[PDB]
Subunit: 286 residues, 3 copies
């Protein structure tokens, strides 16, 4: 409901903003993908008159949605511009020194320091990254997370509209509870700016749960059913449903085709979360 | 004194367990079945625990509401009348047009006290579904009792069960706040302790299990001495799991299938102990 | 973490201790497999200076990890040597009188009394047992639970390192909430004594959630992915992932091969649980 320009976050933009990095060919034939990611302390107006003191990768919450193809060599040049030490811990296969865990290898990246995370894009699937500095709750909850999607080498069946949805919460008044919730950064954004999709088109959603404090989050779409692929790691779906649940760190792919035009609500099927920001609409054009 | 007797409580969970409402049917030009129900939202008091009177909002004067049953592809009409003091809707889990979704602000939206609306859609997809009110504030409109099961039988592929039943897991918020004071399957705390679910040894038992529990983020289901195949949302013909314990957040539901190998009493309850001890526990009684 | 000798629990030993019990051959040719289990009250130092008044099976939390082959005839000879009535309720197929439920058959086993639970090892999978005396919460939460592993009749492809991990909590104080969390008995144990595994070898973990009060637990491993088999009841995996959730009573098998040497953290992806004890390392050689 806070306008994107004022809030500092544009959830509509984030929805389809896949950062494929800058590519080059290695002397082995493989593709190299590179990103720069800077941790920066930044204020965000998440609700009318509510300023959230965030810790963010590249000045946005959620952080960049990284995209790679299975097998690619990856380099993430991380610079910490925050007042606190941070890391980037990737969900994916990598060496212990590349794990973003304090005490192992480079460990905590102090303010003003840099480090290059190197690993291969494996396994294929829908993953994520987040800070792993202790105390671990604030370092994730303050905004340090983003999507990491690895497309299978041979590719997936082609989608007409591919998007990313990161579910989070905002702890504004301290304690161990959330005051607001959102998809892609702003409470109620998609109520005022519905997700625009076309009738019958294959929609593919990478749904990632980063919600802290609360043990489980959920996702429901009105009038519609989707195939769900847990972690996006298998090519056949595990469920066909209208409601799925994810604990923190769980994620997957949903695929559907909207059979009818109009507005269809989507939201957490936990009522408390929906009424505090985690609700929106799809607007399906004929 | 035990669980509150059905006659006194105003809900009969045992009857609900096996009451699949097939509606009234007629044949369309095209060969398809037209299946119709009348559903009325009514404010009603229910004695859920001895001396504890829950002021419910109910469809057709029962909590859970009618368990609607259809066959895949049927044309459906639900003739809704709001006889309550507050605006209400019916939002179905199933495929339907936006104007038929029961969401305030979309199409007809909120149904005012005294007013009526016919929800129309096809019975699709096959599976185990549900319906509930979608009026804001969301929590009390579901938690006060406005929900029921909606079962769509596949046209092809599901072996006949010897005993088919429905179990709706809920909670009762009696004193305000964001917490439940009692829990039930099919309406009354501890009913199936006093009136165990009667099944036959070796017979195929098929349960449609639906979670509507508000406030608490997750519910579960465990059966003593037994294992079941579980079909999430009942939308697939092959089971996802073979287990004795499953979990569901609100809005999740599925089919359990089992055959009880031994006669006797077998407890079933939430494997969340708090819920079990506050009414979500019962027995199966397996006859030889 | 508290050292194992002081604590009265050794999580490293528990990790690989599969109790196959005592076996004999029935006239049928079938295996009869038997265990003795005693409920005893015992104090455990779970955190520096924090003494937990436990109710334990055979003086350990978690209790013995029972192992059997599918189809075995089983007998568990139970004696209650505690101050409160107790039972053993098994997750597995059995007759109603063998269910360890108060009011059914022998029901509650009073202090000093004994009962032999008899059933077959069926179905194959990863299971558990725990007390079923009311009030239910303290009777599980005070320590009366353990693993029950039934191997399929034709077997599983062999693991290089097979282990059991029971996730729990400790309610040490007033309210019905947990103050500490662990895998296999001791908060943070595997931080100080990492799980030693070899690079590329098949690791099979029987992961069991017995956590009371909190509705759900989770498991995540850094830099690694595992195949997950819910309840261990199927020979094909349901998921390939790095994070899995279980409510109380849920359990499953995880299978993985570590492709790189070094230390890889494992812990609940519920942050509060990890920071209060449910955190460890794998040390890959
Ligand atoms: Ca707060
Ligand atoms: Ca209350
Ligand atoms: Ca406590
Ligand atoms: Cu950080
Ligand atoms: Cu809905
Ligand atoms: Cu993580
Ligand atoms: Cu809704
Ligand atoms: Cu209503
Ligand atoms: Cu049980
Ligand atoms: Cu719903
Ligand atoms: Cu039980
Ligand atoms: Cu006990
Ligand atoms: Cu991780
Ligand atoms: Cu149990
Ligand atoms: Cu971690």
């Amino acid at each position: 409901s806070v306008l994107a320009e004022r809030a500092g976050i544009d959830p509509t933009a984030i929805l389809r903003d896949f950062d494929r990095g800058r590519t080059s060919t290695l002397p082995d034939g493989r593709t190299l993908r590179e990103w720069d990611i800077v941790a920066v302390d930044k204020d965000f107006e998440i609700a009318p008159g509510i300023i959230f003191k965030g810790w963010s990768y590249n000045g946005r919450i959620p952080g960049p949605t990284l995209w790679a193809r299975e097998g690619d060599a990856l380099r993430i040049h991380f610079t910490n511009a925050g007042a606190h030490p941070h890391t980037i811990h990737f969900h994916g296969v990598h060496r212990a020194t590349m794990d973003g865990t304090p005490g192992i290898g480079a460990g905590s990246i102090a303010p003003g320091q840099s480090f290059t995370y190197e690993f291969d894009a494996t396994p294929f699937g829908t993953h994520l990254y987040h800070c792993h500095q202790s105390p671990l709750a604030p370092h994730i909850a303050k905004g340090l997370y983003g999507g990491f999607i690895v497309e299978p080498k041979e590719g997936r069946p082609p989608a007409d509209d591919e998007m990313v949805m990161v579910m989070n919460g905002y702890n504004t008044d301290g304690g161990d509870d959330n005051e607001f919730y959102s998809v892609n950064g702003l409470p109620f954004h998609f109520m005022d700016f519905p997700v625009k999709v076309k009738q019958h088109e294959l929609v593919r959603i990478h749904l990632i749960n980063v919600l802290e404090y609360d043990p489980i989050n959920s996702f429901h779409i009105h009038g519609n059913f989707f195939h769900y692929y847990p972690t996006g790691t298998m090519l056949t779906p595990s469920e066909y449903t209208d409601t799925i649940s994810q604990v923190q760190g769980q994620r997957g792919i949903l695929e559907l085709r909207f059979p009818y035009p109009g507005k269809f609500m989507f939201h957490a099927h936990k009522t408390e979360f929906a009424e505090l920001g985690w609700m929106g609409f799809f607007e399906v054009s004929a």
